[PDB]
Write a protein that binds this ligand. Structure first.
Ligand SMILES: CC(=O)N[C@@H]1[C@@H](O)[C@@H](O)[C@@H](CO)O[C@@H]1O
Ligand SMILES: CC(=O)N[C@@H]1[C@@H](O)[C@@H](O)[C@@H](CO)O[C@@H]1O
Ligand SMILES: CC(=O)N[C@@H]1[C@@H](O)[C@@H](O)[C@@H](CO)O[C@@H]1O
Ligand SMILES: CC(=O)N[C@@H]1[C@@H](O)[C@@H](O)[C@@H](CO)O[C@@H]1O
Ligand SMILES: CC(=O)N[C@@H]1[C@@H](O)[C@@H](O)[C@@H](CO)O[C@@H]1O
Ligand SMILES: CC(=O)N[C@H]1[C@@H](O)[C@@H](O)[C@@H](CO)O[C@@H]1O
Lengths: 150, 150
């Protein structure tokens, strides 16, 4: 099961549960932060071809739009939650370098900066540009891309 | 280990070894053809993250640029060959729906038609357009996409 870091391409910061817990509470926000440690490692659980659950490795909780909205509007915050259902399905587009939700919007840093400060929230947004690009890299070498689908 | 059909998206035809043999000779051309059977099933052997070998399931031979050059020119024919080496590396881009060789060109039907006739050759070409799109589908449901990387 590949373990990887979700690296914001423009800044080199990574996706974290806010606070960096090895067992974040349900609805903990997902933020960007420069630190690397085992509590910001992720896995991907395939459900249906490209679609699956982005899983926080330390806790097992997965990435949700807050409230579990089926078609989340722009600026809906991303959180971790233990529930599994179809409204938490994403795809890890390692060719265009983005993360897309089942209803078609992407994970962004809130406000869309190419250099978001530590603790910047992540949100859903439909726009496509350099500041929403992410790559999926080895915990052993933050420049080495790894295949999240195996 | 997923077995799949390589489906030309605009026409619905599939990638075949010319002649449909369970053991095509080395340098057998890869063509498009409407038929479905076990001698046009493929598998994908991952080598390095997105890069891997496109493997003819019945024979074990893989897709090569004819002549095995590292940086083949436009209109280089695609063939099957037993050899394994780094000039036979491709990625299966199931987000943009194409097949890309390590040096950057794509698999095309020769001449670029959206509805090529049976037996049309495939070739490498750098252009991107609707007639070089491919999707990767179940041998049991040719309209169901399947994940080729697992
Ligand atoms: C000291 C410590 O554990 N720090 C972590 C930090 O590494 C990062 O995970 C951050 C994300 O909100 O949360 C915590 O502050
Ligand atoms: C009952 C219900 O809708 N539960 C969901 C839960 O499954 C998860 O999606 C969460 C994310 O914030 O939002 C909701 O509370
Ligand atoms: C115009 C502008 O600044 N747009 C970006 C938008 O593209 C998206 O990244 C969003 C995420 O919160 O933040 C900004 O609004
Ligand atoms: C008998 C017959 O037509 N069978 C096959 C056909 O199914 C297809 O694989 C084709 C590819 O060139 O090769 C043969 O014509
Ligand atoms: C060693 C050798 O024969 N060289 C290559 C072979 O490995 C394969 O790439 C082939 C494809 O047409 O082209 C060449 O013949
Ligand atoms: C639709 C079209 O005009 N296609 C071009 C190239 O883009 C390429 O497809 C090539 C492959 O042989 O055939 C044509 O020259």
């Amino acid at each position: 099961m590949t373990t990887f870091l979700i690296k914001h391409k423009a800044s080199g910061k990574f996706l974290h549960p806010k606070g960096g817990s090895s067992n974040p509470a349900n609805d903990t926000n997902l933020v960007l932060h420069s630190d690397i440690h085992e509590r910001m490692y992720f896995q991907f659980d395939v459900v249906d071809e490209r679609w699956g659950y982005i899983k926080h490795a330390a806790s097992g909780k997965i990435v949700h739009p807050l409230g579990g909205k089926a078609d989340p509007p722009n600026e809906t915050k991303l959180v971790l939650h233990q529930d599994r259902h179809d409204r938490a399905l994403f795809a890890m587009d390692f060719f265009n370098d983005n993360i897309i939700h089942k209803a078609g919007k992407y994970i962004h840093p809130k406000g869309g900066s190419t250099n978001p400060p530590n603790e910047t929230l992540t949100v859903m947004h439909g726009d496509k540009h350099k500041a929403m690009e992410f790559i999926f890299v080895s915990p052993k070498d933050k420049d080495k891309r790894v295949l999240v689908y195996v």
